[PDB]
Each structure stands twice: as structure tokens, then as C-alpha cells.
Amino acid sequence: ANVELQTSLGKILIELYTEHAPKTCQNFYTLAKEGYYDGVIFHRVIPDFVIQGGDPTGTGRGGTSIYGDKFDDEIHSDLHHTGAGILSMANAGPNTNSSQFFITLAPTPWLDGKHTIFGRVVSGLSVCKRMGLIRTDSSDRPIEPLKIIKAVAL
């Protein structure tokens, strides 16, 4: 399990924790295979908190997984947000994960509850460190479109 993310700033390399959480990575793998992520904005960027993106509409809402609407997360104790670069998913309820995700930039020990952790960025961390310094309007949204050109799975 390995996915290259040709983002607009640079190159993001991610390895998926299939051994830890298998269900939440299969959808990502087959989703990189289909590659409908082309031309998708990184709609949310909070300095030292997250970079969220992955919705076709670009309004910060929606995005369909292979299951179509939502699925059930799997969490276990040894998963933690102790570092800066953990690739996790996004949700808006008890079990409401959608196609979007984000990358951590700081230890967030308070966020390791209802929230699933499913990635660790092995290379391209510099890119996320600069994403933390992006022009942002009043809402946590970059002014210019922070698209992802294209993504291979490998």
C-alpha cells in the first residue's frame, strides 16, 4: 500500500496502514486507482492544525466513498496523533467518514477519539510544512485554488 499525491505545492508520499485499519485504506487505494481526485482543491488549511481536502464540489462538503455515503471507522489504542504528518480521515458524526482526509502538523492528543488515523507521510513533509504558511481568508480556506493535479497509487 503506497500512494503518491502530485499536489500543487510539491510531492506527497503516503503509506496506508492496511495492517492496522484495513477497511479505511481499501477505499483510498481503489479511489487512487480510479483517480477522480484529479483537480480537487485542498479547501481547508489551518496553520499547525490540518490540511483538509478531497471533495469534488470544493465547498467543503460531500465526497462519496466506494460504499457511497459513509462507513464505520476502526480505532485501536496504539494509534495516536503524537507526531506531525499522520494522515487521517474526516467525519461529521459518530460514524460519518467521507472521501476527504487531512494531514497533521502537530501533536493532537485530544483528537484521538471518534477520529480514525490511517496514514503516515514518509516523504514530502516539507510540502505540508509550507502548506501551513498558505494565504488564507477569514475562513480557513486558501484564496487561490490549491488543487491536486493528479495521484498515482503505487
Binding site: 481547508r44 489551518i46 492544525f49 490540518v50 483538509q52 467543503g60 462538503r61 460531500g62 474526516a90 467525519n91 461529521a92 458524526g93 460519518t96 467521507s98 476527504q100 487531512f102 485530544w110 483528537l111 477520529h115 480557513d140
Partner: peptide, 11 residues
């Protein structure tokens, strides 16, 4: 329902 779908930023 119109959910924000985000970690709901502490900052």
C-alpha cells in the same frame, strides 16, 4: 442537516 464535515478547529 448541512454538516460542516471537519475536525471543528479548536483555534
Amino acid at each position: 442537516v448541512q454538516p460542516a464535515l471537519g475536525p471543528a478547529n479548536p483555534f
